[PDB]
Design a protein around this ligand. Structure first.
Ligand SMILES: *OP(=O)(O)OP(=O)(O)OC[C@H]1O[C@@H](n2ccc(=O)[nH]c2=O)[C@H](O)[C@@H]1O
Lengths: 698, 7
């Protein structure tokens, strides 16, 4: 019954917790509460260690008690909130944060937590506002500072940028050395000039969050298979992803499970997310040898069991530290070999992951120390895209001459050839080769549809569709779930691009741009007069900020053109209108790289040091275009400028990309799978020979 | 509406 006894047991548990003996801390907290059940701080403390353990159901119950006992316990409201947030109850979590702020207007954490809800919802200015409040209230607040730094990054606010970066690095350095969880997220760590064994350590440290959550299951190590006898000579590969559905990762690899050779491999796909109804999910389900819905098995222990009992040899992590991940599954270690692949552009830092599937251009051996996993090399690029399958209507194009330009008025369509054969005066410019409709009555009808902004027209019985209206014609085609069944017109005038200008595009989200990158681009734009830069409102609130820094750098408003974010198919297609694409060196376009290359638009890149900044170079190396890879900023500007000023060289490079995108291995999902299969077999031969993982650099 | 890789 004694509050002073209970108080002691609390202090003793706080001690066992500092030494990370969480096991024992709980036992003590629980005794403290058996002695004195009305003890507010013991309830709160027990709750926050249950939250660390992922026992959210029970952690919540103890937070509620803490509040009942001490109603002004602002701190407990805030943590309850975090628990509800992790339990997917964002509504009630938000109510907790607001309620804390009412009780203690001066309490920084609740402000920060509130800002976190806003950030997640995509409303970034309200996120900034709340983070700023928190920092006014508590100027030394690493979590809020870094989160704010990221929001600012997202909207391209570069106020006191250089000083801001030095502080982030400083904050991380301090947290790593004090053995705290860093405030920068591993999935963001490539955006900041971090000291790089740092990036690895930030990842490592997020890996640990899993260990704590799986220990409470007390699961013995699993017994992995040591031959292929049970699995009938077939190597069992499990792909684990929360992204079998409408997601970039599916837009890259949806064709792969079906392309595996069924004589040597048995393919299991473990979905971490429910069926979103899209064709992407349909395909994977239909083509994988086995499809397993783990969103129905929410307990990590039971799910890992299932993986093991299915008999997997290689388990593939397609998530890393992206939303939806359940790395606890990998931490449980149900398969003898476990590899990172494709979905996450960095190291996991975790011991439970064995290999990272990458390539020699992305991760040269010089920089093996960036990754905790052993490197496993694909022979060309580890990147792949499903564009050949998704958007075959962009394999060939045709243009309208309105005065011979390949990117001013563009037609694509499965039945394009047939339509052109019904026309009288088609000229065939050689390169395949590109048909050119002359300015006749037909050409005018097409242009009129585009100018008047109409949905579609008919010409000689063929359906001609307006490129801006595809979601109205066939919504599944707009998303990339179907191949369009009409001929589609795409024009510069549609997006307010000048008919007779050099267009430099970048279709990435704006967070990938930094003040140096924008400087580089300004340099290129001044040196190539009449040229424009083509960017997306991604997000829209970022636009005025860029316009601002642009004019600061002496570029009138009209030299940068912003378009809205398009549906997947329109987005890929309208790349055809660009002349060159300028790739962000901070963090490369990834899926976006593939998207711009599929349109046959050359892309200038400058491979940095981090994985994420080397992918574009890797894609280009594979395509066979070494002349678009710069060694430094001066070279980047030069390549770009040459492309803009020397029209003969441009046509040459553009033609080379247009050709190579079929003929190189870059978009060839069959060849890719086969290379991936060879890599898997290497990893296995090695393991079955009794060896621990080492580099597979061929 | 237009899905992206998120942290
Ligand atoms: O994987 P990346 O880092 O290259 O791409 P993001 O993770 O930033 O997400 C981009 C996704 O958005 C698509 N997209 C771009 C522009 C647009 O107008 N529409 C659109 O859907 C990209 O295709 C990619 O899937």
């Amino acid at each position: 019954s004694c509050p002073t006894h209970a108080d002691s047991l609390n202090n003793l548990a706080n001690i066992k917790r500092e030494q990370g003996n969480i096991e024992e801390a709980v036992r003590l907290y629980r005794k403290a509460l058996e002695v004195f059940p009305e003890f507010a701080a013991a309830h709160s403390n027990l709750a926050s260690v249950l939250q660390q353990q992922g026992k959210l159901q029970e952690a919540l119950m103890h937070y509620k008690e803490a509040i009942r006992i001490s109603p002004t316990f602002a701190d407990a409201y805030s943590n309850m909130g975090n628990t509800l947030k992790e339990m997917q109850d964002v509504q009630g979590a938000l109510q907790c944060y607001t309620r804390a702020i009412q009780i203690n207007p001066a309490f920084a954490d609740a402000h920060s937590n509130l800002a976190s809800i806003h950030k997640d919802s995509g409303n970034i200015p309200e996120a900034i506002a709340s983070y700023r409040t928190a920092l006014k209230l508590k100027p030394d607040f690493p979590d809020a500072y870094c989160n704010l730094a990221h929001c600012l990054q997202i909207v391209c606010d570069w106020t006191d940028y250089d000083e801001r970066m030095k502080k982030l690095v400083s904050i991380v350095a301090d947290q790593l050395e004090k053995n705290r969880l860093p405030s920068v997220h591993p999935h963001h760590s490539m955006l900041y000039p971090l000291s790089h064994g740092f990036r690895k350590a930030i990842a490592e440290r997020h890996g640990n969050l899993c260990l704590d959550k799986i220990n409470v299951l007390h699961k013995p190590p699993y017994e992995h298979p040591k031959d292929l006898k049970l699995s009938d000579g077939r190597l069992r590969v499990g792909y684990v992803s929360s992204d079998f559905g409408n997601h970039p990762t599916s837009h890259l690899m949806q064709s792969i499970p079906g392309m595996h050779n069924p004589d040597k491999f048995e393919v299991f796909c473990y979905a971490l997310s429910p069926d979103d109804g899209t064709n992407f999910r349909v395909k994977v389900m239909a083509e994988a040898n086995h499809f397993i819905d783990l969103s129905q098995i929410p307990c990590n222990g039971k799910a890992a069991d299932r993986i093991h009992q299915d008999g997997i040899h290689i388990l593939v992590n397609m998530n890393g530290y992206t939303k939806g991940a359940r790395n606890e599954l990998f931490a449980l270690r149900p398969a003898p070999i476990q590899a990172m692949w494709l979905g996450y552009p960095g190291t996991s830092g975790a011991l439970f992951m064995d290999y990272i599937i990458t390539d020699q251009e992305t991760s040269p051996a010089e920089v093996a120390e960036q990754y905790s996993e052993k490197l496993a090399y694909m022979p060309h690029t580890f990147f792949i895209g499903d564009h050949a399958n998704m958007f075959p209507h962009l394999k060939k194009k045709a243009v309208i001459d309105f005065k011979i330009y390949d990117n001013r008025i563009v037609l694509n369509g499965i039945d394009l050839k047939a339509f052109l054969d019904s026309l009288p005066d088609v000229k065939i410019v050689k390169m395949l080769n590109m048909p050119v409709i002359p300015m006749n009555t037909i050409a005018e009808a097409v242009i009129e549809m585009i100018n008047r902004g109409q949905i579609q027209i008919t010409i000689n019985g063929f359906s001609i569709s307006n490129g801006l209206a595809t979601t109205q014609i066939n919504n599944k085609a707009a998303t990339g779930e179907e191949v369009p069944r009409t001929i589609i017109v795409t024009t510069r005038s549609q997006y307010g691009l000048p008919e007779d200008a050099i267009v430099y595009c970048n279709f990435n989200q704006l967070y990938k741009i930094d003040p140096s990158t924008l400087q580089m681009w300004a340099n290129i734009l001044k040196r190539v007069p009449n040229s424009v830069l083509w960017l997306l409102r991604f997000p829209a609130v970022g636009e005025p900020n860029i316009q601002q820094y642009a004019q600061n750098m002496g570029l009138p408003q009209n030299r940068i053109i912003f378009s809205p974010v398009a549906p997947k198919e329109e987005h890929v297609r309208r790349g055809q209108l660009a002349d060159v694409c300028l790739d962000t060196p901070l963090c490369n376009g990834h899926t976006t790289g593939m998207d711009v290359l599929w349109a046959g638009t050359p892309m200038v890149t400058m491979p940095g040091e981090t994985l994420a900044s080397r992918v574009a170079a890797s894609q280009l190396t594979c395509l066979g275009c070494l002349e678009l890879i710069a060694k430094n900023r001066q070279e980047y500007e030069d390549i770009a400028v040459k492309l803009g000023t020397d029209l003969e060289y441009l046509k040459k490079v553009r033609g080379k990309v247009w050709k190579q995108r079929i003929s190189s291995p870059l978009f060839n999902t069959k060849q890719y799978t086969m290379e991936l299969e060879r890599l898997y077999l290497q990893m296995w031969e090695h393991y079955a020979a009794g060896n621990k993982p080492d580099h597979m650099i061929k | 509406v237009t899905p992206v890789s998120t942290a």
